[PDB]
């Protein structure tokens, strides 16, 4: 629909291929894309399925394990990286594990065309990228899975403060008669 200068995507529950194709098309469209929570991506198939896929990849190159490096590789294969246009589009992508401080205070959007709950049939086994990465070499799973609660607790406290603050204007809305005097316009 509409574009922003920087789009932050919360990759929790997003399929790897579906999100990467959407992100790659947005990168080539002239947009700066930041994907957070790259360790919460999902891949269709059981744990052993993509395990052998990655183990075969290890047999083949600079083997990267971090979840963002997995996602960065998936996006790169969907770009014309052999040309200057593809390389320039790649540099506009920032994939990270977790939500760093510059991004945890910014709004994060989701891609419905890539969400697992709207694309995978219920009862289908799936493999999370973060869990899959943890046994193939990634060693920062525990510390990032511990820090998220600290971010969630701080963010939850912020939402409660914002919700409590909003209650005042919400009550003051219906308090003002002009809200309903000219509410015939649908507002």
């Amino acid at each position: 629909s509409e574009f922003q200068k920087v789009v932050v995507i919360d990759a929790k529950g997003h399929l790897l291929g579906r999100l990467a194709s959407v992100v790659a098309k947005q990168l080539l469209g002239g947009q700066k894309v930041v994907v957070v929570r790259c360790e919460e991506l999902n891949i269709s198939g059981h744990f052993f399925r993509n395990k052998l896929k990655y183990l075969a990849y290890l047999r083949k190159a600079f083997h990267f394990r971090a979840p963002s490096r997995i996602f960065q590789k998936a996006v790169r294969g969907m770009l014309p990286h052999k040309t200057a246009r593809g390389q320039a589009a790649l540099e506009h992508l920032q994939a990270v594990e977790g939500i760093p401080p510059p991004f945890d205070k910014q709004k994060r959007v989701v891609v419905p065309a890539a969400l697992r709950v709207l694309r995978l049939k219920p009862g289908r086994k799936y493999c999370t990228v973060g869990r899959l990465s943890s046994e193939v070499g990634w060693k920062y799973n525990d510390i990032v899975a511990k820090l998220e609660e600290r971010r969630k607790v701080k963010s939850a406290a912020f939402y409660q403060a914002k919700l409590a603050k909003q209650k005042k204007i919400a009550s003051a809305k219906e308090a003002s008669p002009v809200n309903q005097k000219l509410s015939q316009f649908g507002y």
């Binding site: 629909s1 995507i9 947005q26 709004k107 959007v109 989701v110 891609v111 419905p112 709950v117 709207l118």
Partner: protein, 168 residues
């Protein structure tokens, strides 16, 4: 979409046959040209009546008399496969005879990887009795208490701001 045509045909009269017999079949085709060709092919392989010596005397599309009433249709079909000889019978619950035949074609072309030319319908009947229903799936659909949640909900404007509710 498919259309049900009733086609009546007969051989060209000759000195041996002053007046020939009339042969009528109810067959499904997207257009009248397909129905006439299928009718001649059925006559050629059932009555050994050549198209050159025969002519179509009538053709009329038939609409479903009660398209707003749920019905159960049993279809007897003949499958031409690698073996080339199969007899099958299926039951579909829908509102029109056309829909059941379309559903049958979709089912067999999917499961059995068949084609329109190979599949030939001997008969389509309407099962008006619950006891006459044979398939367990259709019997469930006729139970007094159909009660199930909405299936396969799945519901440009990319980059939605909030998580989908995808529920009640």
């Amino acid at each position: 979409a498919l259309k049900e045509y009733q086609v009546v045909g007969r051989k060209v009269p000759t000195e041996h046959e002053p007046v020939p017999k009339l042969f009528r079949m109810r067959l499904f085709a997207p257009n009248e040209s397909v129905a006439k060709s299928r009718y001649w092919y059925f006559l050629k392989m059932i009555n050994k009546v050549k198209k050159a010596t025969g002519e179509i005397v009538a053709i009329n599309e038939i609409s479903e008399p009660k398209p707003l009433k749920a019905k159960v249709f049993g279809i007897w079909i003949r499958y031409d496969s690698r073996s080339g000889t199969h007899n099958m019978y299926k039951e579909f619950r829908d509102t029109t005879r056309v829909g059941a035949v379309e559903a049958m074609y979709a089912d067999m072309a999917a499961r059995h990887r068949a084609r329109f030319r190979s599949i030939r319908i001997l008969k389509v009947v309407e099962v008006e009795k619950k006891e006459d229903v044979r398939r367990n799936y259709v019997k469930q659909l006729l139970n007094p208490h159909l009660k199930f949640p909405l299936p396969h909900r799945r519901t440009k404007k990319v980059f939605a701001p909030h998580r989908p509710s995808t529920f009640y």
